[PDB]
Amino acid sequence: YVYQLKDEVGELKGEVRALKDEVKDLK
Amino acid sequence: YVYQLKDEVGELKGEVRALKDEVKDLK
Amino acid sequence: YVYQLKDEVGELKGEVRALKDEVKDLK
């Protein structure tokens, strides 16, 4: 329940860093 | 405090899946 | 461990609101 969200927040976190990166190129 | 972040991580999580999707079309 | 993810979920959360915003202009 805490670990679950733990590693989870670790993936949306990466996923997001990516989005910021690729979209930023798109501009 | 844990539930709060719980359903919260459930929305940024979806929101993100969307962004990945729409932006990916943008490329 | 809970606080850590706490403020963390607070940043991906903002970061994401931004992405939704800027990408949405991109369309």
Q: Which two tokens stand for residue B3?
A: 């539930």
Count the domains in chain B: 1
The shortest CB-CB distance from A26 to any of B5, B6, B26 is to B26
* B26 contacts in chain C (CB < 8 Å): 23, 26-27
* B2 contacts in chain A (CB < 8 Å): 1-2, 5
C-beta pairs of A17-20 under 8 Å, 24+ apart in sequence: A19/B16, A19/B19, A19/B20, A19/B23, A19/C19, A19/C23, A20/C15, A20/C19
Q: What angle do CA C12, C14, C15 make, to 5 degrees?
A: 60
Q: CA end-to-end span of chain C, whole Å?
A: 38
Record: contact B5-A5, CB cut-off 8 A: yes
- Enter the resolution in angstroms: 2.9
Method: X-ray
> What's the rounded Cα separation, in Å, for the pair B1 and B25?
36
Domain encompassing residue A25: 1-27
